[PDB]
Design a protein around this ligand. Structure first.
Ligand code: 4IP
Length: 343
Protein backbone atom coordinates (compact mmCIF):
# COMPACT_ATOMS: atom_id res chain seq x y z
CA UNK A 1 0.00 0.00 0.00
CA UNK A 2 2.64 2.51 1.14
CA UNK A 3 4.70 4.18 -1.56
CA UNK A 4 8.47 4.29 -1.39
CA UNK A 5 11.11 6.82 -2.44
CA UNK A 6 13.17 6.78 -5.59
CA UNK A 7 16.70 6.80 -4.15
CA UNK A 8 19.38 7.77 -6.69
CA UNK A 9 22.69 5.96 -7.13
CA UNK A 10 25.49 7.48 -5.04
CA UNK A 11 28.22 5.20 -6.44
CA UNK A 12 29.78 7.75 -8.83
CA UNK A 13 29.62 10.74 -6.44
CA UNK A 14 31.18 8.73 -3.58
CA UNK A 15 33.84 7.46 -5.99
CA UNK A 16 34.55 11.06 -7.08
CA UNK A 17 34.76 12.30 -3.47
CA UNK A 18 37.20 9.49 -2.58
CA UNK A 19 39.19 10.15 -5.79
CA UNK A 20 39.48 13.85 -4.90
CA UNK A 21 40.71 13.09 -1.37
CA UNK A 22 43.26 10.58 -2.69
CA UNK A 23 44.54 13.14 -5.18
CA UNK A 24 44.71 15.92 -2.57
CA UNK A 25 46.88 13.83 -0.29
CA UNK A 26 49.39 13.33 -3.12
CA UNK A 27 49.17 16.90 -4.44
CA UNK A 28 46.87 19.48 -2.77
CA UNK A 29 46.75 21.81 -5.79
CA UNK A 30 45.71 18.86 -7.99
CA UNK A 31 43.18 17.45 -5.50
CA UNK A 32 41.49 20.85 -5.14
CA UNK A 33 41.36 21.44 -8.92
CA UNK A 34 39.81 17.96 -9.39
CA UNK A 35 37.10 18.62 -6.80
CA UNK A 36 36.26 21.99 -8.38
CA UNK A 37 36.05 20.42 -11.89
CA UNK A 38 33.75 17.71 -10.59
CA UNK A 39 31.43 20.16 -8.81
CA UNK A 40 32.30 18.90 -5.34
CA UNK A 41 33.95 22.15 -4.23
CA UNK A 42 33.52 25.84 -5.06
CA UNK A 43 36.53 27.86 -6.25
CA UNK A 44 36.60 30.78 -3.78
CA UNK A 45 39.35 31.03 -1.09
CA UNK A 46 36.65 30.78 1.59
CA UNK A 47 35.22 27.56 0.12
CA UNK A 48 38.65 25.95 -0.16
CA UNK A 49 39.37 27.13 3.41
CA UNK A 50 36.18 25.41 4.68
CA UNK A 51 37.24 22.23 2.85
CA UNK A 52 40.68 22.24 4.56
CA UNK A 53 39.21 23.30 7.94
CA UNK A 54 36.81 20.33 7.95
CA UNK A 55 39.70 18.31 6.46
CA UNK A 56 37.69 15.08 6.16
CA UNK A 57 40.01 12.27 5.03
CA UNK A 58 42.75 14.89 4.44
CA UNK A 59 46.41 14.57 5.48
CA UNK A 60 47.16 17.40 7.92
CA UNK A 61 50.82 17.66 6.83
CA UNK A 62 49.60 18.27 3.27
CA UNK A 63 47.10 20.89 4.55
CA UNK A 64 50.03 22.75 6.17
CA UNK A 65 52.15 22.46 2.99
CA UNK A 66 49.38 24.10 0.94
CA UNK A 67 48.45 26.81 3.47
CA UNK A 68 52.07 27.96 3.88
CA UNK A 69 52.53 28.74 0.15
CA UNK A 70 53.35 32.24 -1.19
CA UNK A 71 50.73 32.14 -3.99
CA UNK A 72 48.02 34.86 -4.00
CA UNK A 73 45.25 32.25 -3.77
CA UNK A 74 46.90 30.32 -0.90
CA UNK A 75 47.41 33.50 1.15
CA UNK A 76 43.68 34.23 0.90
CA UNK A 77 42.88 30.60 1.73
CA UNK A 78 45.11 30.83 4.86
CA UNK A 79 43.42 34.04 6.07
CA UNK A 80 39.99 32.44 5.63
CA UNK A 81 41.26 29.23 7.33
CA UNK A 82 42.39 31.19 10.40
CA UNK A 83 39.09 33.14 10.42
CA UNK A 84 37.27 29.79 10.84
CA UNK A 85 39.05 29.26 14.19
CA UNK A 86 37.47 30.76 17.28
CA UNK A 87 40.10 32.26 19.55
CA UNK A 88 37.93 34.69 21.53
CA UNK A 89 38.11 34.13 25.31
CA UNK A 90 40.91 31.59 25.05
CA UNK A 91 44.36 32.03 26.55
CA UNK A 92 47.31 31.68 24.14
CA UNK A 93 48.00 27.99 24.92
CA UNK A 94 44.32 27.09 24.42
CA UNK A 95 44.23 28.95 21.12
CA UNK A 96 47.44 27.17 19.97
CA UNK A 97 45.97 23.79 20.98
CA UNK A 98 43.03 24.50 18.66
CA UNK A 99 45.14 25.89 15.77
CA UNK A 100 47.76 23.14 15.91
CA UNK A 101 45.05 20.49 15.76
CA UNK A 102 43.91 21.75 12.33
CA UNK A 103 47.15 21.13 10.38
CA UNK A 104 50.80 20.11 10.88
CA UNK A 105 53.42 22.87 10.67
CA UNK A 106 55.58 22.66 7.46
CA UNK A 107 59.40 22.50 7.75
CA UNK A 108 60.26 25.66 5.81
CA UNK A 109 61.01 28.83 7.83
CA UNK A 110 59.04 31.16 5.55
CA UNK A 111 56.01 28.82 5.58
CA UNK A 112 56.00 28.54 9.41
CA UNK A 113 56.28 32.33 9.67
CA UNK A 114 53.33 33.07 7.36
CA UNK A 115 51.12 30.63 9.28
CA UNK A 116 52.14 31.84 12.73
CA UNK A 117 51.76 35.51 11.70
CA UNK A 118 48.24 34.68 10.47
CA UNK A 119 47.54 32.90 13.77
CA UNK A 120 49.02 35.74 15.85
CA UNK A 121 47.08 38.46 14.02
CA UNK A 122 43.83 36.52 14.52
CA UNK A 123 44.49 35.83 18.21
CA UNK A 124 45.12 39.54 18.85
CA UNK A 125 41.96 40.58 16.95
CA UNK A 126 39.80 38.13 18.95
CA UNK A 127 41.49 39.06 22.25
CA UNK A 128 42.27 42.78 22.19
CA UNK A 129 44.33 44.22 25.04
CA UNK A 130 46.04 40.95 26.02
CA UNK A 131 49.23 41.63 24.02
CA UNK A 132 50.71 44.98 23.02
CA UNK A 133 51.64 43.84 19.50
CA UNK A 134 51.26 41.02 17.02
CA UNK A 135 55.03 40.49 17.50
CA UNK A 136 54.56 39.88 21.25
CA UNK A 137 51.93 37.17 20.54
CA UNK A 138 54.08 35.59 17.82
CA UNK A 139 57.17 35.47 20.01
CA UNK A 140 55.28 34.20 23.09
CA UNK A 141 53.70 31.49 20.89
CA UNK A 142 57.18 30.22 20.16
CA UNK A 143 58.22 30.51 23.80
CA UNK A 144 55.24 28.25 24.59
CA UNK A 145 56.22 25.88 21.77
CA UNK A 146 59.84 25.78 23.07
CA UNK A 147 58.53 25.09 26.58
CA UNK A 148 56.44 22.18 25.25
CA UNK A 149 59.63 20.73 23.79
CA UNK A 150 61.69 21.40 26.96
CA UNK A 151 59.19 19.81 29.37
CA UNK A 152 58.10 16.89 27.20
CA UNK A 153 61.12 15.84 25.10
CA UNK A 154 63.29 13.45 27.12
CA UNK A 155 66.42 14.72 25.30
CA UNK A 156 66.11 18.03 27.16
CA UNK A 157 67.73 17.33 30.52
CA UNK A 158 67.12 20.51 32.56
CA UNK A 159 63.38 21.10 32.90
CA UNK A 160 62.38 24.75 33.40
CA UNK A 161 60.51 25.80 36.51
CA UNK A 162 57.50 28.14 36.34
CA UNK A 163 59.86 30.90 37.57
CA UNK A 164 62.40 30.27 34.79
CA UNK A 165 59.59 30.50 32.22
CA UNK A 166 58.30 33.73 33.78
CA UNK A 167 61.76 35.42 33.84
CA UNK A 168 62.76 34.15 30.36
CA UNK A 169 59.89 36.27 29.01
CA UNK A 170 60.77 39.55 30.70
CA UNK A 171 60.37 42.51 28.34
CA UNK A 172 58.32 40.60 25.74
CA UNK A 173 55.30 42.94 25.89
CA UNK A 174 56.80 45.73 23.72
CA UNK A 175 59.48 46.37 26.35
CA UNK A 176 57.32 45.63 29.40
CA UNK A 177 56.43 42.42 31.23
CA UNK A 178 53.32 40.33 30.82
CA UNK A 179 51.28 39.53 33.97
CA UNK A 180 53.07 36.98 36.17
CA UNK A 181 49.94 34.86 36.65
CA UNK A 182 49.18 34.81 32.92
CA UNK A 183 52.66 33.38 32.20
CA UNK A 184 52.32 30.92 35.13
CA UNK A 185 48.95 29.76 33.74
CA UNK A 186 50.44 29.17 30.29
CA UNK A 187 53.33 27.29 31.89
CA UNK A 188 51.09 25.06 34.06
CA UNK A 189 48.77 24.28 31.14
CA UNK A 190 51.67 22.99 29.01
CA UNK A 191 53.24 21.15 31.97
CA UNK A 192 49.94 19.38 32.69
CA UNK A 193 49.21 18.47 29.01
CA UNK A 194 51.62 18.51 26.03
CA UNK A 195 50.32 19.82 22.70
CA UNK A 196 48.27 16.99 21.16
CA UNK A 197 49.42 16.72 17.55
CA UNK A 198 47.32 14.96 14.86
CA UNK A 199 48.89 12.00 12.96
CA UNK A 200 51.80 12.38 15.40
CA UNK A 201 55.03 10.65 14.32
CA UNK A 202 57.07 11.92 17.29
CA UNK A 203 59.04 14.36 15.12
CA UNK A 204 56.76 17.38 15.14
CA UNK A 205 58.08 20.96 15.44
CA UNK A 206 56.23 21.39 18.79
CA UNK A 207 58.21 18.41 20.19
CA UNK A 208 61.59 19.27 18.63
CA UNK A 209 61.92 23.06 19.02
CA UNK A 210 65.23 23.25 20.85
CA UNK A 211 67.15 26.13 22.38
CA UNK A 212 70.65 26.30 20.81
CA UNK A 213 72.01 28.92 23.24
CA UNK A 214 74.80 27.86 25.62
CA UNK A 215 76.75 28.94 28.71
CA UNK A 216 79.72 27.62 30.73
CA UNK A 217 83.12 28.37 32.27
CA UNK A 218 86.16 28.03 30.01
CA UNK A 219 89.78 29.16 30.06
CA UNK A 220 90.79 31.75 27.48
CA UNK A 221 94.12 33.09 26.27
CA UNK A 222 94.71 36.88 26.07
CA UNK A 223 95.44 39.01 22.98
CA UNK A 224 98.55 41.17 23.31
CA UNK A 225 99.33 39.72 26.76
CA UNK A 226 99.20 35.93 26.57
CA UNK A 227 97.61 35.08 29.92
CA UNK A 228 94.98 32.40 30.60
CA UNK A 229 91.74 33.53 32.34
CA UNK A 230 88.72 31.59 33.63
CA UNK A 231 85.70 33.28 32.05
CA UNK A 232 81.96 32.64 31.90
CA UNK A 233 80.84 32.24 28.29
CA UNK A 234 77.42 32.77 26.78
CA UNK A 235 76.60 31.89 23.16
CA UNK A 236 73.44 33.51 21.76
CA UNK A 237 72.39 34.99 18.42
CA UNK A 238 75.76 34.23 16.70
CA UNK A 239 77.81 36.18 19.25
CA UNK A 240 80.02 34.91 22.05
CA UNK A 241 79.87 36.96 25.27
CA UNK A 242 82.26 36.42 28.17
CA UNK A 243 82.12 37.60 31.77
CA UNK A 244 84.33 37.64 34.84
CA UNK A 245 81.37 36.39 36.97
CA UNK A 246 78.03 34.67 36.17
CA UNK A 247 76.37 37.47 38.15
CA UNK A 248 77.77 40.32 35.97
CA UNK A 249 75.39 42.09 33.56
CA UNK A 250 78.36 43.86 31.99
CA UNK A 251 80.45 41.60 29.75
CA UNK A 252 84.23 41.49 29.83
CA UNK A 253 84.09 41.12 26.02
CA UNK A 254 81.83 40.43 23.01
CA UNK A 255 82.94 38.43 19.94
CA UNK A 256 80.59 38.49 16.95
CA UNK A 257 81.01 35.12 15.17
CA UNK A 258 80.02 36.34 11.69
CA UNK A 259 82.83 35.52 9.21
CA UNK A 260 84.64 33.35 11.72
CA UNK A 261 85.48 29.70 11.80
CA UNK A 262 86.57 27.29 14.54
CA UNK A 263 89.29 24.60 14.64
CA UNK A 264 90.84 22.27 17.23
CA UNK A 265 94.44 23.15 18.16
CA UNK A 266 97.31 21.70 20.20
CA UNK A 267 98.69 23.77 23.07
CA UNK A 268 101.95 22.98 24.92
CA UNK A 269 100.30 23.74 28.28
CA UNK A 270 96.50 23.59 28.10
CA UNK A 271 94.39 20.56 27.11
CA UNK A 272 91.19 20.42 25.00
CA UNK A 273 91.84 23.64 23.05
CA UNK A 274 90.05 25.21 20.12
CA UNK A 275 90.52 28.54 18.29
CA UNK A 276 88.25 31.07 16.66
CA UNK A 277 89.87 32.58 13.53
CA UNK A 278 88.96 34.36 10.28
CA UNK A 279 89.35 31.88 7.39
CA UNK A 280 88.94 34.57 4.70
CA UNK A 281 91.55 36.95 6.13
CA UNK A 282 94.46 35.01 7.60
CA UNK A 283 96.38 36.97 10.23
CA UNK A 284 93.75 39.73 10.48
CA UNK A 285 92.63 40.98 13.92
CA UNK A 286 89.13 39.70 14.77
CA UNK A 287 86.52 42.42 15.28
CA UNK A 288 85.48 42.35 18.94
CA UNK A 289 85.14 44.69 21.89
CA UNK A 290 86.26 44.27 25.48
CA UNK A 291 86.65 46.28 28.69
CA UNK A 292 89.89 47.41 30.32
CA UNK A 293 90.55 47.55 34.07
CA UNK A 294 89.85 51.31 34.10
CA UNK A 295 86.38 50.84 32.61
CA UNK A 296 87.23 51.89 29.06
CA UNK A 297 85.90 49.79 26.21
CA UNK A 298 88.38 49.13 23.37
CA UNK A 299 88.67 46.88 20.29
CA UNK A 300 90.07 43.38 20.77
CA UNK A 301 93.65 42.66 19.69
CA UNK A 302 93.18 38.97 18.81
CA UNK A 303 94.20 37.27 15.60
CA UNK A 304 92.83 34.04 17.15
CA UNK A 305 90.73 33.36 20.28
CA UNK A 306 92.28 30.24 21.80
CA UNK A 307 90.05 28.60 24.40
CA UNK A 308 90.62 25.56 26.64
CA UNK A 309 87.79 23.24 27.82
CA UNK A 310 88.01 21.08 30.98
CA UNK A 311 87.34 17.81 29.09
CA UNK A 312 87.50 16.57 25.48
CA UNK A 313 83.70 16.18 25.68
CA UNK A 314 83.12 19.85 26.47
CA UNK A 315 85.59 20.90 23.75
CA UNK A 316 83.57 18.83 21.23
CA UNK A 317 80.25 20.24 22.54
CA UNK A 318 81.40 23.88 22.33
CA UNK A 319 82.86 23.31 18.86
CA UNK A 320 79.59 21.74 17.66
CA UNK A 321 77.54 24.55 19.17
CA UNK A 322 79.77 27.31 17.74
CA UNK A 323 79.78 25.67 14.27
CA UNK A 324 75.97 25.40 14.32
CA UNK A 325 75.69 29.04 15.39
CA UNK A 326 77.92 30.20 12.49
CA UNK A 327 76.05 28.09 9.89
CA UNK A 328 72.87 29.77 11.19
CA UNK A 329 69.22 28.73 11.24
CA UNK A 330 66.90 30.91 9.11
CA UNK A 331 63.91 30.51 11.42
CA UNK A 332 65.80 31.22 14.67
CA UNK A 333 67.16 34.36 12.97
CA UNK A 334 63.66 35.59 11.99
CA UNK A 335 62.55 35.05 15.60
CA UNK A 336 65.62 37.03 16.73
CA UNK A 337 64.56 39.85 14.37
CA UNK A 338 61.07 40.14 15.90
CA UNK A 339 62.59 40.15 19.37
CA UNK A 340 64.78 43.17 18.46
CA UNK A 341 61.71 44.92 16.94
CA UNK A 342 59.77 44.36 20.18
CA UNK A 343 62.65 46.13 21.95
O1 4IP B 1 94.84 40.65 32.83
P1 4IP B 1 96.18 40.36 32.23
O2 4IP B 1 96.90 39.16 32.75
O3 4IP B 1 97.03 41.60 32.08
O4 4IP B 1 95.89 39.90 30.69
C1 4IP B 1 94.77 40.39 29.95
C2 4IP B 1 93.70 39.29 29.93
O5 4IP B 1 94.24 38.08 29.37
C3 4IP B 1 92.51 39.77 29.11
O6 4IP B 1 91.44 38.83 29.22
P2 4IP B 1 90.04 39.25 29.88
O7 4IP B 1 89.52 40.42 29.05
O8 4IP B 1 89.20 38.01 29.77
O9 4IP B 1 90.37 39.71 31.29
C4 4IP B 1 92.89 40.05 27.66
O10 4IP B 1 91.77 40.64 27.00
P3 4IP B 1 90.83 39.89 25.94
O11 4IP B 1 89.49 39.76 26.63
O12 4IP B 1 90.77 40.83 24.75
O13 4IP B 1 91.46 38.55 25.63
C5 4IP B 1 94.04 41.06 27.57
O14 4IP B 1 94.50 41.11 26.21
P4 4IP B 1 95.12 42.45 25.55
O15 4IP B 1 94.29 43.63 25.99
O16 4IP B 1 94.99 42.19 24.07
O17 4IP B 1 96.52 42.42 26.10
C6 4IP B 1 95.21 40.75 28.52
O18 4IP B 1 96.07 41.90 28.58
Amino acid sequence: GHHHHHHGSTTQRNAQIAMGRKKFNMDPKKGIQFLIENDLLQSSPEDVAQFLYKGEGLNKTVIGDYLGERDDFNIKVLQAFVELHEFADLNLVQALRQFLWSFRLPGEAQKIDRMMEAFASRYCLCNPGVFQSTDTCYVLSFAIIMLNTSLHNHNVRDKPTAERFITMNRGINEGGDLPEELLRNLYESIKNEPFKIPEDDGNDLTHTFFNPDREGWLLKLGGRVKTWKRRWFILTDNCLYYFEYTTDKEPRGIIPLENLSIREVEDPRKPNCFELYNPSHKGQVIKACKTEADGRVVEGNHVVYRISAPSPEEKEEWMKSIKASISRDPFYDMLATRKRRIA
